[PDB]
Design a protein around this nucleic acid. Structure first.
Lengths: 181, 203, 96, 93, 148
RNA sequence: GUUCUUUGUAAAGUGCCUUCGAAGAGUCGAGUUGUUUGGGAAUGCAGCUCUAAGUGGGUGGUAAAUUCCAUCUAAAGCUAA
RNA sequence: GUUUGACCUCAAAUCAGGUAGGAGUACCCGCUGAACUUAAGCAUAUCAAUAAGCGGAGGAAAAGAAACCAACCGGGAUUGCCUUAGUAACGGCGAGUGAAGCGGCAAAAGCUCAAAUUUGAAAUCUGGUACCUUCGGUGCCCGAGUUGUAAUUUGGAGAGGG
């Protein structure tokens, strides 16, 4: 019931005939980058991070770069990591030991799997892999086992939530009362 | 260091020593021309932090700009349209006087590139700025990789296009929920979201 | 500390903890010995501004409330007026 | 009505799952064995959040088998109906 | 002199047996503004000379108070070109001296006492007592005649 | 790949302790006018007036006062896809 | 010494060497700025932060490594697409207008100054000139420069002493 076509919309119309050709040029650019970058992946190793926004906090997700604490714990430096093929993010901070240990083991696996060539010479041929993302996939952590013993205590979670709500709602009043005391 | 003392002292503008210096220097600048070459900065600390370096190819121009609002140059203040436009002496010129001064100075000195500018003084009638410029044909700046970027041709009339700090401010280019309509370009976002995207297989 | 439920005073799922590090762009603007020395000396040189001269008279005559009001008007906000009046109180109690 | 400045539909994300289904979240392979084995010492835990469900409701009957339900929110009648079968509701965030 | 010092240093140290014993300890004036303001606040300076004529006078207005506070004997000298002469520049805007030979220690001390007595002890009051209330000669004659 | 030069005992990275840790002003910000925005007790900009601070400052989409918390570090700058 | 010079500021040269203009302007960065129309007639409004007009660039431009988003178990430069959404919100609450965070994706890249005493050595740089292996190098001579050119340091840190 609301169609926004009172302006000169016919001037500003984009039709995506260029879809297929753009896909082809994107593939060709990836191939050319691969040739120019030959022994290396085309993708930097990214960390695992937990998403924000309660709708999405259940999921774990790939991030921008590893922290400096994670990098030092792994036992190499940020600059050498950036040369080796690792993304680093100076502004991400670590408040979760699970994520910390996960990304540390990620870096350990990467270090063990890679093969670095010396600066001076030899350069043995290595048969490039194109996807560190596929080589080191993101893993959703496992919350609990499939089956378990039931244990009931009789506090009825409904009432528990109601009491939490009530104390949140009536916090300030009781504090001001105890103040007036 | 003395630049720190200079900074903290130039912050104290309503003290006796600074209002004396102001009262003298404004008279000097008003007896001089509207645009004129300054042998050295009045404010070396400000110039130093804005990017001046006391060596060859760095130039300072003092410039004067008339104060007040914008008047639309229609004959006899008549606009010949709906009455809702406004009173005519109440228009504000989105670009700042600093930008006006930068652009006039760059028009006088077209071989130079405008690096920056800073307020020095003002009167009821006039405001006074010192503009820092660079010579990209000078070899000391074509070398010296910290300033060889100004010699590339995408930095022609930065002041006219709105790439100096006053230009970025007047365009409203910063990050946040406040600068949502003008973050990558006001007209860019307008053209982007007043645009009908239609794919091959219609969605 | 969290509770492990979706509501309450401290809601959310329990993770262990980390205290990663104190960042250095948190102690910004903190007073250094050099800043203290420079600013004290520049005050000794430049002295007072006219509204500060008014404030020192009005704290002695009129009290701190008129000072806070007129300083809120000459400056922008009450938060800055409070600190300006505290500064002037300290200048008075020192020189006197 | 009243207003809401800067509304964003992630504060309000709270999809619902009635008790009637409640075993679709268990795969089919596992479902019929857990049904026949009405073991209280070993019952299948059902994580509703990972399935994409915030609250649990009680529209219909489940069998009398134990089950461990993990959810952020529930209804009184849902908790009642599960406790009847002999299932606890563990709260999560 | 730097060039001959450098070639002598290379001749003595690269082939011979010494590290910095070739060129001895030098004594000289300090002439940079920032360098001198940093020498003060460490209290290494025995004397400071400050040019009366400077473009931005705000470059130097703080220096006398700073020298007073850190306890340094300062003087205000007529001429920045006069300093540039003794330091191989066109201008200097300051000059300092923090150490001397023993032959000149006593002259330096007597000079500092002279400077104190003649400059500061004579002009210690000058933090008050504004200047610049002078008039033109025509206005002065007008005021004189109107007075008498 | 094949030689030319080993530049250098010259620069860089790393562990622990100790003292420090400078960080942009007619600027931020506030009042008013005009304009603009979905921005609503006022989103951004500009003009006039006022004009700061350093355990400080900005933001936290309902205007203020009080107590906390969270997150960034402006008023200078470069950069491919 | 009523002399002889140094500096500062301002000028002049068909002085040595270079540089700007104008065109094009599909796209790009700003400035300035209508009405027809639609709303009943119409001042708000809409057409529209459009057209015309002005200045300025490139092969892309602009933006860009947070004075960000958030309120999560926290994410993590910018740009563009799908979606968020014809939604929150605005409006003679009428005609009508109208975003953003999240999520998936494409592409992925990080950094630099000022503010710090080299002070046991302005260690820096343009030009002129003679050679050379000439998108430049070495030497030499005028000069710039201490009202601060180099190295070192940029908040993620970092410096000094040990």
């Amino acid at each position: 019931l609301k169609n926004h076509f009172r302006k000169h919309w016919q001037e500003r119309v984009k039709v995506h005939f260029d879809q297929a050709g753009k896909k082809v040029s994107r593939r060709n650019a990836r191939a050319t980058r691969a040739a120019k970058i030959a022994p290396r992946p085309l993708d930097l190793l990214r960390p695992v991070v937990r998403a924000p926004t309660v709708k999405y906090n259940r999921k774990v997700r790939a991030g921008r770069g590893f922290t400096l604490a994670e990098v030092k714990a792994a036992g190499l430096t940020a600059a050498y990591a950036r040369t080796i093929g690792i993304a680093v993010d100076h502004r991400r901070q670590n408040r979760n030991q699970e994520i910390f240990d996960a990304n540390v083991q990620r870096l350990k696996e990467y270090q063990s799997k890679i093969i670095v060539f010396p600066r001076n010479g030899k350069a043995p041929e290595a048969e490039q892999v194109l996807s560190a993302a596929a080589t080191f996939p993101i893993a959703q952590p496992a919350t609990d086992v499939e089956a378990r013993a039931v244990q009931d205590n009789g506090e009825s979670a409904f009432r528990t939530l109601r009491l939490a709500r009530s104390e949140k709602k009536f916090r300030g009043i009781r504090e001001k009362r105890a103040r007036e005391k | 260091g003395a630049y720190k003392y200079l900074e903290e002292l130039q912050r104290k503008k309503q003290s006796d020593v600074l209002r004396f210096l102001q009262r003298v220097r404004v008279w000097e600048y008003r007896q001089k021309n509207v645009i004129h070459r300054a042998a050295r900065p009045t404010r070396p600390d400000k110039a130093r932090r804005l990017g001046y370096k006391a060596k060859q190819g760095f130039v300072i121009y003092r410039v004067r700009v008339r104060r007040g609002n914008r008047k639309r140059p229609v004959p006899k203040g008549a606009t010949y349209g709906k009455p809702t436009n406004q009173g005519v002496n109440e228009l504000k010129y989105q670009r700042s006087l600093r930008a006006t001064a930068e652009e006039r100075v760059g028009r006088r000195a077209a071989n130079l590139r405008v690096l920056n500018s800073y307020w020095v003084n003002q009167d009821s009638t006039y405001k006074y700025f010192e503009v820092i410029l660079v010579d990209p044909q000078h070899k000391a700046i074509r070398r010296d990789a910290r300033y060889n970027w100004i010699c590339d041709p995408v930095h022609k009339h930065r002041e006219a296009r709105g790439l100096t700090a006053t230009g970025k401010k007047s365009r409203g280019i910063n990050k946040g929920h406040k600068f949502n309509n003008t973050k990558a370009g006001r007209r860019k976002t307008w053209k982007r979201q007043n645009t009908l995207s239609l794919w091959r297989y219609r969605k | 500390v969290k509770t492990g439920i979706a509501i309450g005073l401290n809601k959310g799922k329990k993770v262990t903890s980390m205290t990663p590090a104190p960042k250095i762009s948190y102690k910004k603007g903190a007073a250094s010995n050099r800043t203290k020395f420079v600013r004290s000396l520049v005050r000794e040189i430049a002295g007072l501004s006219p509204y500060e001269r008014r404030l020192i008279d009005l704290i002695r005559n009129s009290g701190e409330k008129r000072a806070r009001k007129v300083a809120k008007k000459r400056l922008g906000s009450f938060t800055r007026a409070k600190a300006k009046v505290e500064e002037m109180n300290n200048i008075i109690a020192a020189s006197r | 009505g009243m207003r809401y400045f800067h509304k964003q539909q992630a504060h309000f994300w709270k999809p619902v799952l009635n008790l009637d289904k409640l075993w679709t979240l268990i795969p089919e392979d596992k479902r019929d064995q857990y049904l026949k084995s009405a073991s209280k010492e070993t019952a299948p835990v059902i994580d509703t959040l990972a399935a994409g469900y915030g609250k649990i409701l009680g529209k219909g009957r489940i069998p009398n088998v134990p089950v461990i339900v993990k959810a952020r929110f529930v209804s009184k009648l849902a908790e009642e109906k599960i406790r009847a079968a002999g299932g606890v509701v563990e709260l999560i965030a | 002199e730097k060039k001959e010092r450098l070639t002598k240093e290379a001749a003595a140290v690269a082939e011979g047996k010494s590290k910095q014993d070739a060129s001895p300890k030098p004594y000289a004036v300090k002439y940079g503004l920032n360098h001198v303001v940093a020498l003060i606040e460490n209290k290494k300076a025995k004397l400071v000379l400050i040019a009366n004529d400077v473009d931005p006078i705000e470059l130097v207005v703080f220096l006398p108070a700073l020298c007073k506070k850190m306890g340094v004997p300062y003087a205000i000298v007529k001429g920045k070109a006069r300093l540039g002469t003794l330091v191989n520049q066109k201008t200097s805007a300051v000059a300092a001296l923090t150490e001397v030979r023993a032959e000149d220690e006593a002259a330096l001390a007597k000079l500092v006492s002279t400077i104190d007595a003649n400059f500061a002890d004579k002009y210690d009051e000058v933090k008050k007592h504004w200047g610049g209330g002078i008039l033109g000669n025509k206005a002065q004659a007008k005021m004189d005649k109107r007075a008498k």
